[PDB]
From a paper:
DSB recognition by and activation of PARP1 is proceeded by actual phosphorylation of H2A.X13, which ultimately culminates in γH2A.X foci formation to induce a cascade repair response. Here, we produced γH2A.X using a hybrid chemical approach and assembled nucleosomes with either H2A, H2A.X, γH2A.X or mutants of H2A or H2A.X as the incorporated H2A variant. Nucleosome stability/dynamics investigations and crystallographic structure characterization were carried out in combination with surface plasmon resonance (SPR)- and bio-layer interferometry (BLI)-based techniques to measure the kinetics of PARP1 association with and dissociation from the DSB constructs (represented by the blunt-end DNA termini; Homo sapiens histone and PARP proteins). Additionally, enzymatic assays were performed to shed light on the catalytic parameters of PARylation. This reveals that PARP1 recognition of and activation by DSBs is modulated by histone variant composition and post-translational modification status.
Numbering used by the authors:
A (entry chain E), B (entry chain A): 38 to 135
C (entry chain H), D (entry chain D): 28 to 122
E (entry chain F): 16 to 102
F (entry chain B): 21 to 102
G (entry chain G), H (entry chain C): 13 to 119
Amino acid sequence: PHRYRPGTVALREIRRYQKSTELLIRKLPFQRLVREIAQDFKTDLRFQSSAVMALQEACEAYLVGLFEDTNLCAIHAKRVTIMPKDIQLARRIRGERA
Amino acid sequence: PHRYRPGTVALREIRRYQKSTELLIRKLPFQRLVREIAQDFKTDLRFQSSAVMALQEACEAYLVGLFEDTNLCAIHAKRVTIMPKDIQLARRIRGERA
Amino acid sequence: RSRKESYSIYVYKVLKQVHPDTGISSKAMGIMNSFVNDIFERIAGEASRLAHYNKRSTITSREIQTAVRLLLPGELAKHAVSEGTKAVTKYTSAK
Amino acid sequence: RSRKESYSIYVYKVLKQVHPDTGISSKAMGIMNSFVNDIFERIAGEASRLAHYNKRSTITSREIQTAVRLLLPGELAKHAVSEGTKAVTKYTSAK
Amino acid sequence: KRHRKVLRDNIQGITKPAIRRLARRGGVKRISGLIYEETRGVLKVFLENVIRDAVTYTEHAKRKTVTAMDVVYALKRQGRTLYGFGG
Amino acid sequence: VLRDNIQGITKPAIRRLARRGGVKRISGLIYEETRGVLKVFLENVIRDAVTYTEHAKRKTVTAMDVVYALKRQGRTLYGFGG
Amino acid sequence: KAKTRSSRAGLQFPVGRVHRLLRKGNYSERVGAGAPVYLAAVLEYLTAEILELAGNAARDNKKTRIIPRHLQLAIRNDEELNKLLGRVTIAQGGVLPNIQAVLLPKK
Amino acid sequence: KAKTRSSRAGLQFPVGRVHRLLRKGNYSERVGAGAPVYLAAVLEYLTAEILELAGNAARDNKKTRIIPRHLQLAIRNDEELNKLLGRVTIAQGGVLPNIQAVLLPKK
DNA sequence: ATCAATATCCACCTGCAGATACTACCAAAAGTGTATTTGGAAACTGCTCCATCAAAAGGCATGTTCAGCTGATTCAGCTGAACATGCCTTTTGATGGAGCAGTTTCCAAATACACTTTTGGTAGTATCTGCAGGTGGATATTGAT
DNA sequence: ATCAATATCCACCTGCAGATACTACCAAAAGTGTATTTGGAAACTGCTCCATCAAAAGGCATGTTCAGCTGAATCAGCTGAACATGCCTTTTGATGGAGCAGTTTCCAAATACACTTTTGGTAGTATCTGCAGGTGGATATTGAT
Ligand SMILES: [Cl-]
Ligand SMILES: [Cl-]
Ligand SMILES: [Mn+2]
Ligand SMILES: [Mn+2]
Ligand SMILES: [Mn+2]
Ligand SMILES: [Mn+2]
Ligand SMILES: [Mn+2]
């Protein structure tokens, strides 16, 4: 009953996802989240389907980029594990919460 | 013979310099450096007095801000001493390079 | 010798309404001028984009209002909007 | 059904000049269209500002040129400036 | 008539595996258990900000439908220029 | 006693900037690192300033040339016009 | 006979000048009559808000003349103004007193 | 003998179109005759630069059709295009393969 | 704990750099009265957004198990901080001219007009053909022993 | 260093989606010359204000000493990775309905335009005075003992 060691499959996944371009969040749940948030600003809105897809492409690219910065913050602290404090430092230095 | 401990004067200077607004680089050497760099783009240039001063205000405000972010990166790695790698992380996450 | 316009007369007048016994240095006044010109440009630029996106040739107070909502943080925007609307009302209700 | 214009035609001509046997997906073409629109606005914006800063009411090829030098990095600026200068010189002399 | 079903708690549709996948694309090898909730909060802030601006353009235009272009202009305003959806 | 102009940005002056930035303790390698960063900053801003100078057919860099440079570099400065 | 548009709108800021700056800035082909009024009032409002807080900072430091320092203290201590002006440098402003906790001595 | 201004200037990109976009964009009162020529040329040059590199990435991946991924690989592997487009997201572009060295196994 | 050395605070002074106040003249705002432009009001499209639902794969949730990472401990050796001086660089102030910027001039060049020609974007169709995704099947890679 | 389990790779094969490619066009653009106005390059000066430059004056380059920081080596507890198992949702593909973007025509309002009347705002300068430090002395902080 064989087993890959901790880290091996994580590396395999890094290679797989850095090679591909498909969106990583499921479509319908993301769509519901957009509609919920927008509905809290303004009732009775409709969305072009491409508007939702534009939002998803932007959200994902933003989060991927943030994780890259976060990873660099963890490594700077001599860790390999990302923590909330890494995300917070990344955001602070980016001026999203300076 | 009297002696303040490592860190006591450093804290004093932080308090002193954070209270004040005077420029902290001497004027003439800054002016020279500005003229030198400018000479590579166009020869025989003059500068208004206010041009050099705008440059020095901008440059010092930038460096002070960068030292704040640098300090946060040192502290993130459980140090109190800023190092080149801290400046380098801060610049990377700012998008100023890499 | 040509005329170099600025907002300093008006900044000074607003200073006296708000703090009648308070003055302002020349440097502080230059910062206030920079401030007014910056926000002018931000608001006018957003309004211009808004008109262009809606294929309109005209910037009205409605483009200024929406620009203010896009550019100012919450509470600032609310009061700016109410001040803007008040001034336009006063200006219309004035033979 | 009203006409929605794009740079597609011209992007595709340039593609065939550089890579005769290479095609392009419509999504890729959407990207190229965004890119051209984006660079147009950036250059036109810098040119507008530059003309205003010098109290000129005309955007000439000299404003476009300086805008290009302000916006593009090193080598791309050099080569863009040559291709722009050469298109104008040719255009002027080709009348 | 019918009236839309109540939307609530849809931030949880941003699941732990979807967040791990995004982290993997970002080069991340190991992920603290607290990351998932922190990421949902960051995502919500980002989406709220961009949707707020998009809806502002929708309302300014007097439409009830958020277009791709409303989103593209909102993202541009936000210094997050996106190519591939018009403009 | 000739010395490089960049070195006229001295250890004590860099130390003062750091202090205003809230820094308590500084590695010896910071001084040269900071000089490199300062030079890149000055290069980028001066290049744009001089590009505006040249465009206005001038031989004098104005405060406004610097102000416009700083603005397009995302370093907007208040107090020197514009 | 001739009344200023500012005085009609109840403003210190110059409605006429704002109108002209809108015309000659190539923002649009046309400019509605309300637009300069609205814009002038917004700019006045924001100016009043900063001078109010800067005046208070001058008062706190036993001073009657507003300097750049007082503008910086006003702006950076106010969450909304700090955000509006997050990418702006106030010449001769300095910074807020702020020392990270871990740098403080113990005993 | 109606000649296009593009043909006169030696360009694939549309000079007339660019002239009109500059006019309708409220950039300035007037637009010089050289301006749209110089600008169409620059835009053409940059699109050739991108398509050359993207076609290469397509060929490298044994493909005949350029897709957004090839555009992303071209832009992000070129120092200058990466800087020009540093604040732009290419939809369906993905990222460059890149694993920080410390994360690889062993010693 | 003491005791002292040095930093820090506060009240008071006062000359002057740098404010506020005053004045006249003129650019540019506002008043008047045509002359263009525009952006909803109404009145219709067709599109596309919504919702619905059925089938089924595919990814999600959960529990178990343990590898190896984080963070605590301790510590030695290294490195920056503190500190006392005289030389060197900076700063301060005043001289000559480089060039800004003010001003008028006039023509090459731009706008506006209103015609003619051409294109590019379409809807309609056909029509091909690059490649997604699936199958073997050969070949690394990993981890245990 | 061997071998076994399993992920990887690669090259073929289909049947479409999506791309290319015609029409066959035709509405909107673009562009062809006239009539027309005018922006700004050019050439001249004068007066700021900038580079220089030499005297006055106050930071910094320096070497030594040791406080306490960093980074190393070790270890334990616990997190978070991996994977097996069960099954809930999202994905996919339609149906039908209608909400609403997107056009087109009147034009009554709303701007722009050309002219003229006036005045607010600038820029010279004339005064006025907030406060930058300078003093004196009292107290708090720091660090040794
Ligand atoms: Cl209006
Ligand atoms: Cl031109
Ligand atoms: Mn080729
Ligand atoms: Mn006391
Ligand atoms: Mn189970
Ligand atoms: Mn409608
Ligand atoms: Mn005092």
